[PDB]
Every structure is written in C-alpha cells, then in structure tokens.
Symmetry: D2
Subunit: 511 residues, 4 copies
C-alpha cells in the first residue's frame, strides 16, 4: 500500500489522522537496542508524530486556509500547502514565505525538518524536469504526487566516516550502485543526519560512476533501516514532565543514521543515474539549493520571535531588565530576530525568473542567511546564558516539587517573579527557557543551527562563489576599477579635482 | 544674498559650479590656527568641495538624471533628487533607495554626510507640517525651499562637554540657549560638536528651562556662526602625499568640526520649535526624520561595502593568498555582510507603512537593525582585511615619487610584482587604495565614524528594543510564547493531541 | 554526633568510607517531590558521593601523599591536604597549587565544588582571626577543625529573587536574624546555587543590621533544608549508561536552593554579628576572595587539559584534523588551556606577605582568571561545536545498540574512526565529548563557568577596582603622566628631540 | 670602519652619541623618491634615531644601570644590557624580563624592534655555537661582539612577492640566493620585506637548490645593501603637525622597509649556515632564537598595555563616561588583558628549563600563548577604546596652532573642557595622545603590526598546537583522557567505587 492511499480524498493532502495511519507501515527503526513496532505509539516518537499531524490538520481548517493553501496546478481540482507548488512570481514567493511561517508557528520554530522543507525539492522537479533527461517523466510524476498528497519527504546527504587504514572496504561505505536489473537498481551504503526520517514517507538520496546517483527511497522498502540517536522525547517523558521539558516532550526530531542494505529502487524512483556531469551540475542547476533556504530562514525567524519574547519574559522574572546593559543585550537579540525576517523579505522582493515561468528567491539573501545564522544563534545563546546569571542553574527538579506542599511552601516564598508573577509561572517560564538552550534538546538545537548547511568555511565559500557566479563581484569590481582609473602615479586623470603641485612640500623639504 | 539665488534657473537644483559659488560667502571657518579665506580654494577643503559639486552636476546629466531625479511636487514644473520629495508608496521608497545608491557611488560610499542625508529632514517638514503649530508655514516653506533648490543641509546634534566642577551659572552657558527675543527673531548662543562637513553646507538644523527647548535653521554665513575644524586628511595627503598614495583622503575627507554660535540672530522664518519641551521630547518619535534618514545611511554603507568587498578581492589576488581555503572563507564572510545591508534596504522599502497626509515611512525595525549591525560588521570586516593582507600593507613604498625615480623603480619592478601577474605599479596602487580605506588617518576616522554613527553601543540596542515594544512587535512575539505556555501546566498537557507521560514516567517506581 | 567523630583517628582527615558514613545524618533534602533518605545510596547522589569519597581516600595513599599532604600546623602531629593549611611563602602556594591539581585530576576537572574550594575559607579564618573581634576564638577553632578533619564546607551566597510588588514580606526572603538567645541566634531565609551542598558537612552563610551576618550552619541542623534541581546522575542512570553519559553518571554536583527555617545557630558558629562595617570590609580584608580563585583557576586548567586532548581525539576520529583551519582551531584551544596554567604560575610566583606570616596569591592574576574564564569557555565550546560538524548529532542512542548484533553490524561498517579506531572506541570518544558540552550536564557546566563568580560587568568592575586599590593604576598613570610632561603646545620639553620649526610647512602653505 | 670602533671604551656598549655617529656611514636609504643623506638629521628618521640613542644612554645612567645591566661573561671586565648575555637560570630570565621592561618604558611600549629584540639571536649563537659546524667560531665571535658592544641587530625574514606568470628563470632571482663563492666570501642577491627600523640598525641577520639555503650577517653600510622606505609618520607629523598633535608618531616611528641586496659581498666571518637545507630546516627548532625572542615581545606589549590602560582611564575621566557601569566594565576588561601579558611573562621565567651548555630557555608554551592571544587582545582593546570614546576623538581641534591663536582658543576654553575639571589644553592633549595611539596612520600601522607580528592567524595557532605535541604536553593531556575512558566500557564501570545502573535503568521495562 502507498502512503497516499490512506487519504479518504484525492483532492487534498493528508489530514493528521491519515498521516498517522500512513506511518504504521512496518518501517525498520531501531532505538535503545530494540526495534520500534509503531512510531505513532512508541514513547520516543509519538508526540513528535502528533506534532507533525497537527500541521496536516491545519491545512483543512477554514480559518487557516487563506494563509496556508492554494489550489494544485495539476488540474486535479484539489488544494495543497502553498510551498508544495512552483512559485511563478515574487508575490507567489511572499505568499509561500507566509504559509511556511504559519506552519512553523505551530512548533514555535522548533521543528526544522517539517514536510515543507523538502517540498522545495518537489518544486525543483516540477519547475525543471527536462534537467533529468531520460528521467524527466519521473521528475514530473514525483512533483505531482508530492504536491497533491503533501507527501513527507526528507533527505539523507551527509556521508558516513571512512577508516583511512582499511584496504576495497573503503568504496563500500558510501551509497553505491551494486546491480542494474529490469525492475530497477540495487543500492547499498549509508547516510548520516537523517533528521526526523522516522516520521517521513520517502527520503531523497544524492571517478567511479556507480557513486553518481540521485533517487527516491520509501521508508518501508526492504533493506531501508534507521539507527536512532538518544530520544529527548522519551527521556523527558520517563524522568520529567511537559512542565519541566515543554519543548523536548513534543518537538524532538530524531537525527538518525539511514542504512541501505541491498535495496531495490524501481526505475520510477531514479532521477540521476551513473552521471557525474548531472551530479556536479545539480547544486547550481537543480533548483533545490536555490529554494530550501527560504524555508530555513523563515523557520529560524519564527524560532527567534519565540526566543526574543521568552528572553524578555525571563528577564522580567529575574528583575534584571531594569539594568541598561541587560536591556542593550535584549535589544541585540531583537536586532538578530529582525535580520532574518528582513532577509526573507529580500528573498521574495528580489526574486528572479528561472525556467518555464518559475521564480527563484534572491540567491545572495539565501547565502547570507546560511553565513549569519550560526553566528547569530551562538551569540543569542551566549547573551541568554550571561543574562540569566543564576535563575536557570538552580530551578527545582520537577513539577512534583510544586505538587508537594512541604517543598511548594518554600518555592512560593523564595522563588517568586520580580515583576509580580507567582512561583509556578516564574519556574514555568525559566524551565521553558532552559529547555530551549541548556537541556540535551537545547544543546542539539545549537549544534543543528551552527552546522545545518555545512562547515563555517564551506558556507562562506558558497557565499563567495554566488557573488562571483551571479556577476555581483564583477559589478563591485567595476566600481573599484573606476576609482583606480581616476588617477595614476602622475596625479588625477579626471578634470574636476585639484592636483597637489601647488601644495606638495616634499621637494622644498628634501632639497 | 540667499544660496538659492546662485541658480540661473528656479526649475532645478544647483549645478556644481553654482554650488561652489554659493560657498564663497561670509562663512567663518578656522583650521590650523588660521581663518579660511575661501573653502573652494583652501587646500584642506577644495577637493571635498569639488566632490560634492560632482553630485550636483550628476543631477543634470542625461545618463544619470533617470535614476536620480523626479519632478517637484510643488507645482514649479522643475525637478529634484528623488530623496528631496516626500515618498507616497513603497515603490517611491525603492526609487529613492536607488537614487541614494547612485549618488553614493560617486564617492564609492566614502562621503557620509552628502546633501541627501538631511534631505529626509526637509521631507519630515513637508509630510507633517502641522506638528510645528504656529511654525507650520515655516515647515511648509522650508520643505519647498530644500526640495526645489537642493539646499545642502546638515546638523550638529552632539552637545559639547561640561566641566562638572564649574558653578551652576557657567555650566548652562555651554549648550544652545535662547539669549533674547526680538521683533526680527531670536538671539542664540552655545555650541554643537561633530558638525561633519559643515564647512561645505548651506544651512544647519540645530535641535535638543524652556530657553534650551529650541529647533531652528541656521545659515552657515550668519554673523556669529563659526567652525573650528579638526585636522584635514585632504591637506595632509596633498602636502606630503599624492592621489596615488592617498586616493580617498585626497578627495572625500568630510571635516568633523565644532559648530560655535556666538549671539546669532535667527529670523522668525527659521524657527521650528520655540521654548517647547513637549514638542522637543516628541520630535524623535513624531517628527519623521529619525524614521527616514537611516534609509540613506544603510544604502551609503552598502555602497561602501560593495567597494571594500571587491577591493579586498583585488588585494588578495595581488598577495596570491586568495588560493587558500581560509582566505576565501574570510572574503566570503565580507560578501555576506555586504549582502546584509542591501537586503535590509530592500526590506525598509517593501515593508514601508502609510504615515500622515499620504506619506510613507520605511520599515522601522529594519532601520534599527541597520544601526545595531553596522558597527559590528564594519569592525569585523576591518579585522578580516588586517589579518588577511598579513604583510602587503605595512611595507608599501613611501610615494609615487619612488615609482617616478628609475633608480628606486627598477627594484620595485623586480621585487614588488602582483602574484596574479599585475605589474608593480598596479599592485602598489591597489594596496595603497586598501590602506587609505582602513589604516590611513582617514581610514581610522571612518572606523570611528561607522562604529559611533548613531550613538553608543548600548543606546542603539536600547532603541532597537524600544521600537519592538512601541510598534507592538514584542506583544505579538509574546502572544506566541503565551500560547506555548497555555498548552501545558504542572499536571500535564492542556491540549488533546499530545500524550501524557503517566504510562512511561518511572520516578514513582525509582524513588521512595 | 559531630562529622569528625566518624574518623577512627584524630591525626588525619576522613577516609572515603568515614566521609560516606558521616553523610548518613538525617540531613533534610528534597528531589523530585520526595525526601532523600540517604545521599550515599540515593540514585541522584550516590556516584557524586562516591567521587568525593575517592578524594578523601587519595590523602591516605603513600604514592600520592608527597603531592597532596603536609603535616598540620596545629601541633596535633597529624596530616592534611596542603590547601587546608595557611600558606607562608610563594613556594607554599605553588605546592598547594599542585595539590589542588592532583585532586582535580581525579574528576578530570569536572567537580568544581570539592572540599579544597572552601578550605581557602578555613585558611582565611586561621590567617586573620583578629578581624572577627569578639568572634576571634570561633575563627581559630573553625580553622583547626577544618584543617585536622578535612571538613567539607560549602557556601550559599546568591540571594533568592524578590517580588517588587509585595508589601514587610520583602524583608523576610533574605537571610535575617530573627532572635538572639543565650545558646545562639535564630535565623531564617534562603540562598540559591548551593552547589553540591547535599554532600557537605557545613555551609558558610554570609540599613537594618539584622541582615549583616556571617555564620557556619551544619547540614543536619533542624530547619536546614535543600530543594534540589534535576539530577543528571539519576537521569543518566535511569535512561542511559556510563558508556553513554560518562561524566553525568559520576560528577554531577546538584545546584540546590538552601532553606533556613527558624534555625538555631550556636554562638560558637557566629563569625560576624549585626555588623555592616565588618560585612562590607570582609571581601577586601577577610582573605577568602583573595584565595579561592587559585583553586578555581587550577580546577579549570585541569578541565582544559581534558577538553584539549578530548577535542584532539574527537578530530582524529572525524579525520578533519588533516585540515589547516581545523588544526588552527585546536591550536587556539591549546592556547587557552596554556593561559590558565600560566595564570596559576603567576598567582604563586608573585605572591605577597599578608598578616601573621601568611601569603596571598597575586591578586591581579585572580581577577584576570575571573574575567577570561567565561570568554575562553564559551569560545572553546563554540570551537568544538563548529569542528565536530556532524559526528556528535547522530551518535547511536545507547550501549544497547552496540550490544544488539543486528544494529552493531552496521555501526562496525559505517561508524569507524578515520584514524583506524573501531566503532566502539569512536562512539565512546564522541559520547564523552557530547557529555562534556551538549548533554544537560554539559549545558549546566557552561552556565556554571560563565556565571561562576558573577555577572560579566561585575567581574570586569572587580578587575578594575583591584588595579585601582593595589596602586597598579597609579603606576600605569605615572608612565602616561611622564609621556604627557615631555611636550606641550609649544613643542618638546625634553632636549634630546628635534622640534619641527625647521620642517613644519603650515605657515608657508596657509600664507 | 666597524660600528664598534665608534666607542671610546671597550668596557661598555655604545652611548647615545656614539650610536648616532655609527649611523653616519655609507648606508643607502631611499624615501619619497630621494636618497637619505644622513639618517640622524633626515626629517623622516631623526627623532626615531634620537629615541634609540636614549636607550643606549640609559645603560650608563646610575639610576637605571642597576635594572638594565650585568657584567659581560666574556672576561672583558665590561658591562652590557642583561638580555645581551646568555641566561643560566630562571632568576636570570626574570632579571632579563625586568631589563627589557625598563628599556621598553622609555618608548612607552611603542618601539617594537629596539636592540634587545635581536639580542636574543646573539644569545642563541653564544649558547649553542656547535650547531653551526665549520662556522662555530663565527657564532662565538658574533656573540662576543653583540654582547660587549650592544650592536643593534635586526632581521628581514619575510620573502618578497613572486609573479606566478613569469618564467621559472625570473621567479627564483627574487629570493636571497648565492651568486658566487670567492676567497674573501660569498656574493648574494635578492630582497626581504618588512625590514622594520633597518634604517637605524648596524647589521641585519638574513635567513631562509642549496644556493637558497643560507644564513648570514650583513652590515647596513655594505655595498649593494639598499632600503626602500614606507611613508614616514615622523616626517608627516613634523611637516603638518606638532609633538602636541602627534606625540607618538613624532618620536617612535619604526620605518617598515624593503631590504634589497644587489651583488653584496658577505665575508666568510659573517656566514653562519652555508648551502645547507638540513641546518636551515632545523634552525627554528634547534637554533634557540625562536625559543627566546617572544619573551622580549610579550614584555614590550605588556608595557604598551600599561600605557594604553591608564591612557583609556584618563580619556574616560575627560569624557565623564567613567561614571557609567558599562564603561567601567569595558575599562576592567582592558585591565584584564594588560594583566594577562604580565602573567605570561612571569610564567615564561618561573617555568624556564635547562637547554645546552648551562643555558636556560623561557617556558615554550607561554611564548606560543603570547603569540596567539596578542592579536585578539590588541584588536579587542582597540574596539573597546573606539566604542567608549564615542565623540571625543573625531572632532579634536586641528592643531596646537588653534590653542596658540586667542581668537580660536577662547572658544576651546569654554566648550572643550574636561568633565573631571581639566582645562581644555589638558583635555585635548590626552585625547590627541589617545588618537595617535589608535587612529593616526602610526596607530593604524601599530594595529597591523600587533595582529600580523609573528605570522598569520592560522600559522600562530598551528605552532601553538605543534609545541603542545613536540613537548610531550599533548601526550600527558591524552593520558588523562585515556584514563577516563579506561574507567568504563559498554557493559558499565570497570572501577569498583561506582554504582552500576542495573538497579535503576528503566529501558527494559519501558521498551518491547
Ligand atoms: Ca561672516
Ligand atoms: Ca654605501
């Protein structure tokens, strides 16, 4: 059974209930040395699964449909989330920017790999299917399927480590073509950082041409397996509570290892085959890399709306918000929050036509978001840590402490909010702040924001390459060349400026 | 004679020639212990004056007029720089953004107080004249005047220091204060500091016991108006250097002066706020100028960053270090900062809101963001340049005189070539241009200017916070946090879609 | 029964066994809404208690005694840890510096509030007992007791928050004298950030003179209670393993709220009584503030030895240590690690005589350590996070994954060390790094290092005040004043320099 | 005539007068397209020459001799600066540290290439002469010479740029290379860049196909030795300023030149390494100099930070902002950085280790730490100053000529007073001193110098890592991590004092 067959109607994406039923497919997932029977009921994934299901439910609410949905461009007569359909103007991109922000607000910016992230990949297939040559019809069909059903795609792109001392064994670790058959291709290898793949329907995977592949793999195919990292949702449930870990308990996106063990990929799922030329050209010509950072920038901007107000609430509680230096530190967090919204505005207003009527967001703004976000996030976290100087480190252990009157009587007296809040509300706000930055979930989120789109050198190199490839550097260079042409070793070459022959005193001085 | 009377036509702003003639008035400027006889010929100001004159000439050039000008809204049938006329849409602001960029490119982003800077003040007077009460007609007339003529306004806003040990009488006399009220106007005395490029301006706007609660326009040639100049990088570059050695110092120096007002008569036609503490306190928020000028400043910086970015790339091509991954990454970060200020200027226009009388204001959050980011970005970009041109800047031959002496030149031709194939003349020229941008006294002054531009580091951050609070932005962010908090309590979830931990919590079994 | 009565001998401090027995005293501690019966057996404290007991055991090992111990100066004929006795030379301080480093190495620098931290307070009482006036004999007796027994002292100094809108109620939150009796004083209030107080014997607590107090409070006195924060030791035990959380499982120092509810403090335990003059003078004259940062700097330097080598091991595993930029980032961590050792060298070599033959470490070096440590620690953590770009975020969940052959077979193939390490060793190293920086314990440690001795402005202000009070600023100022005296508005005032009258061209130019 | 023959006595180093006479030789220096006739009288070098002469005079002053000098170890019965004689204990290094600080205080930390900088090279030759093989006696004789006379040595180590597009023949001719071997010595050609203060030195040490594998001593007056100077901040300050306006530029400028060697004859007595790639590669690690000079550099910077710290405090007293908590915190951080470099110099001496022939070397880890921290600390301190003197530096009156003109001076007396009660003359003087330290072209050059001092940011960090590895420090840190790892495995603790989690782990009960 195909995931899309769980829908009661072919004219709309999944509802939350249909999405949850579609995950009960015998996918192979491991956590804590055991196989997961059902992701929708398992204590490590059930609330994250319920959080994603809320996004699907919002598409069917009349009050949210103007902001979230458009009709499909397929002629099916149905509707879809705006970011699942190819943008054909700067205004289309702005409407998609707002639809992404509306979905991101349902997780307060904490879910980074929701269905709209890879919906940009579906749009890349639909806008430029001709790029894939003999696999053009696969690109067209996959765009149609993703758009109409609201299929939850992810990607597994980071390669696993290689032992430099191994013999043959080295060329077996990476995703490699092992056999070509009539039904399709047989593949083996692994990809790391398969973020929230336990809750997805499909994963896109991308001098020996056997390594030059791009294909779609279903989460329930024989040989497809996930090896999970520690679950902050399960730990928060087993040893904490929603009051103590309000983000860990519902928004944890498990960063897994995606294993492919002798997996048959049907020809209908192949996009690039034994083609080093198309693989090298895909980052620049495919469209996806020129589209997804719009989603990521908006998602971060929503998370920064949350962090900014949460920091203000935390400082109202500590009473340090009265200090000039504290207000200045909060003001800088506000400036960073404003930056990411302004970048998303520029991404849309400066959008350019691409191919087949499609529009792409401003490429310089996408690269800028990638460079600034790790620095802004690390700086904002340091600002929070140095401003809530004492308030976070000694928080009572549990909601159980508030529910024990022998303990609660002291918390009511000694842990009140400076701005008049009762102890229950003060502790609640500070626990929410701690889960955002210092819990294992908070620590993982920092590592995620810093390393998301690559190393610090790599993101800066790609920002430079974009300025060069777009012609931006040539235009900046033309201005410097003009400045240089206006003078030489003999003086000005322009008539409006005064030469120094009448005022230079060096001949008279050095005579 | 009024400065506008130097124009041969009432249908356009000054040409460069007319602007230069208008500066040959009774202005009283001191530098190096001497009174300046004529700013347009004096070795400390002549090239900076010639650089501003080029901006005026560009307004009348067919190849530039399309990007720079619009017709006046006064019914005169004339034209003006787009930023001298009130914006009435988001598209109007984008056109003004482009017109500012075109003028800023004529100085490669190095002149920060050109006439378009205070043209936002003229627009503030025109958009909201009713704010000034009995002085409403002065606001209307000044808007008309500035717009049609392209008058070069400036301001001196920073108060001078006060000795805390002097009597209460002596400390009060230092600030701008009303001395006497007459039939012709008001008599004022005091001083303002950081009167950047006031030597080349027509008028200065001066603003904040009601005798201290004033806002007025003062001509640069009024009796009792005097400027005490700082050291001239233009004059030093001319006397001991050359355009080759100091290519920016020699033409774009904007002298940061002390503006003195010694018993100056201000006619009633030039008064905007009079003995009114309420209007003075309300002006930053309601006047409009503070909500307009950072659009000019952000664009000006973005143009300077276009210049610095490519100049850094050229310098690294010469040193040959551009082949290193870490060097390319450092240049990539400069590119990201350059991109940021352009993206902020895009948002300022696209997110513009209606104000009063059909006027539009740029996005206020984006103006505050530019003010906070610019000092950090500029200091970081300068550090990136310093640590990447590790040797190339410090030993540059002294002078174009070294290149013009064959005995010295023959060794420079052999040992100081560009790594990318440039001859020594071009290699030294590029690196001297980079040094003038960052390490010369002009380069050092520019860093101090970009860092301290719109106030202290705490003040700019406080104003960014105040804007989020006053606009309702903080209330909306707070509504999202309040919604998160309402979804659970000390007993569990308050929303039905999430699973409570009663079936998995192990603390009862573990404890007791 | 007194803690010291648990020792089988009066001529040596506690052994580990005797220290553990001494904690079974009916102290009142809460965690997870429940009373703790015994800290030595409770799942939230038992390993942290066992870790402290190892320090006591090391004092009795012949192989460690040259580095750890000296004879007492009390005439008892016994021995003690070197830092529990007053230093009387620069060499004494250097020997105490080495003894602190030896004890700190037993927790790899992760235990910040071990008995040697407050041993500096015992030494402050012994070096200057005359400061306490009528309480001089209490200072002498407490120094003797702490030194001979190796009593585990802590301090509770951070005040709890105050609700600005409360009426009377405001002046009840802080530690305040409520009654003066023949036996002693009655006190009430609370102190926050009582780090590892669950494992201590005593805590030192320090216009209305009822608030101007300094006294010693036993952990088992009626009305003395601790309200604990979440236990990373218990969470690591319940949902993890030593392999998964190797630091959280044995070095967690619980940051508690210390409550004093109508506590009788006997006159023998009072050090400063209703004396605003002595309270204000104590930071500058007491000695403790001029002593404890030697312990803290050494402790951090040991933690940086650990982090530096752990980062190198982690980069060997990822294989990125081959990159120039990665080696430079590691080199900076090395430079920070070297700084804190160099500061501890200067603290000892530049030591000055104080009172009664006692020596104090260099005060400028103590203030410098306090300013630099938050910046260095935040920077080192950012270096680690941006250099282990992928390796930390997807680590398999558990030692249970390695013990399941179905999962282990893929980890053996795809998660090997780049430098030839097997997957078990690669995962182990990276989990150790993650527990140091990203676990909740790692997050708490960052908050601790940043905020330890106060806000960022406060530590910088105290560094400035030290330069001014010591005469250092006056000497730097004398050099600037000399530079200024060498010229005036007319030229040089010194004869060796050439005036510019023969070369100044301004008269000729401006004529 | 040899430079040492200018001394009236063989029992002491040069006096200031004798040092100045020794510079009036055949040295060939160019500046501003002209050959310098006499460095001691030329307007670009005369005060820098006079500043170095004061250091030599201080060696013979009773009030300073106690801190600066020791007897020679040569048996001559004379004395020398402590840093010119091989250290044979940790206490010897502390005494040399203090002698360096005393000399550095005479320039307030602004002269970075004074004679004590390369005196560490003389000590490297004396401590390990056997390293040089057949040139061992040259090493011994040069140590004796440098120590007894106080010869001013320097080095030019940075190679000049090479055009990558030139033929393999042309690119090779650029670097220092052996041209011919004769009976008298060797003929060399090539160039070195960043020859800081070479115009005022006696000899330069020049070091790294075996023709390129050389180390030798070259006198500044040898035929074919030429300097091409950078712009002179001393001359510019003299021609267009005054000591009041530029108090550091006017006396402490160390010109960063290009050192050219055109068919120079180097006598065999001056050769140290000849056509030996093995000795050239080993010299950084085994020579001793690289393990000695950073003690001088760290002390010199620490003295400059004593100056900057108090100068910042004086400047903030004048602006009156020192009353603000955030301003006091910013000054407190500058104090912490100043304290760091002194603490590093203490550790360099107390942790000194024995080397060869009884010689001691400062702690190597502390030298590498100083190199990594100094560029970050200096850039941060400069940013702190710039953002805290928000207005005070940018508008300073142009000249002492303004104070000497009563018409201008009367307004400065009223409007430019110090907030702490200082008169305008003292307020402007302090702020001009601060500006010359950070924003003048001299201040800009000093920032570039401190940042790029001992190499690129990656290179200094790599050398810090290599030192931890080569010394065994990394192995010892690794032994601690290996011990932590050995205390547990995938089955639990391997140590008996800790409790395993079998009784509390809830995963079996929770899963399956
Ligand atoms: Ca006049
Ligand atoms: Ca000669």
């Amino acid at each position: 059974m195909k995931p899309e067959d769980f829908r009661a109607s072919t004219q709309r994406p999944f509802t939350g209930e249909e999405y949850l039923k579609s995950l009960q497919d015998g996918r192979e997932i491991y956590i804590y040395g055991e196989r997961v029977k059902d992701v929708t009921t398992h204590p490590a994934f059930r609330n994250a699964a319920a959080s994603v299901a809320q996004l699907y439910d919002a598409l069917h609410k009349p009050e949210m449909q103007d902001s979230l949905c458009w009709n499909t461009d397929t002629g099916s007569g149905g509707y879809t989330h705006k970011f699942f359909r190819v943008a054909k103007s700067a205004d289309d991109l702005r409407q998609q920017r707002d639809a992404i922000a509306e979905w991101s607000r349902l997780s307060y910016g904490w879910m980074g790999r929701t269905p709209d992230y890879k919906a940009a990949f579906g749009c890349a297939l639909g806008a430029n299917p001709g790029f894939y040559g003999q696999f053009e019809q696969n690109a067209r069909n996959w765009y149609t399927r993703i758009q109409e059903t609201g299929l939850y795609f992810n990607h597994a792109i980071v390669n696993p480590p290689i032992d430099r001392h191994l013999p043959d064994k080295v060329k077996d670790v990476y995703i490699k073509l092992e056999k070509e058959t009539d039904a399709g291709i047989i593949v083996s290898g692994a990809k790391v950082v398969a973020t929230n793949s336990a809750l997805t329907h499909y994963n896109m995977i991308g001098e020996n041409p056997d390594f030059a592949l791009m294909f779609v793999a279903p989460m329930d195919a024989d040989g497809v397996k996930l090896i999970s990292r520690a679950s902050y949702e399960m730990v928060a449930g087993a040893t904490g509570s929603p009051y103590d870990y309000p983000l860990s308990s519902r928004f944890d996106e498990n960063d897994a290892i995606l294993v492919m063990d002798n997996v048959l990929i049907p020809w209908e799922n192949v996009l690039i085959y034994r083609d080093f030329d198309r693989c090298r050209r895909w980052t620049m010509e495919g469209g996806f890399a020129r589209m997804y950072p719009l989603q990521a920038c908006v998602r971060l901007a929503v998370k920064l709306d949350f962090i900014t107000a949460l920091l203000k609430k935390s400082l109202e509680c500590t009473g340090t918000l009265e200090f000039r230096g504290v207000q200045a530190d909060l003001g800088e967090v506000v400036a960073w929050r404003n930056t990411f919204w302004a970048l998303s505005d520029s991404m849309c207003s400066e959008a350019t036509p691409w191919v087949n009527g499609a529009y792409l967001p401003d490429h310089a703004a996408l690269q800028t978001y990638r460079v600034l976000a790790p620095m802004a996030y690390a700086k904002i976290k340091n600002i929070i840590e140095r401003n809530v100087t004492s308030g976070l480190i000694y928080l009572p252990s549990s909601a159980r402490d508030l529910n024990n009157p022998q303990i609660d009587q002291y918390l009511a007296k000694y842990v009140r909010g400076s701005n008049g809040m009762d102890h229950v509300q003060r502790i609640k706000i500070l626990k929410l702040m701690w889960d955002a930055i210092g819990s294992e979930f908070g620590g993982r989120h920092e590592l995620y924001e810093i390393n998301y789109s690559g190393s610090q050198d790599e993101i800066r190199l790609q920002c430079l390459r974009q300025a060069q490839n777009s012609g931006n550097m040539d235009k900046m260079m033309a201005m410097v060349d003009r400045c240089l042409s206006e003078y030489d070793q003999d003086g000005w070459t322009v008539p409006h400026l005064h030469n120094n022959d009448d005022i230079n005193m060096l001949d008279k001085l050095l005579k």
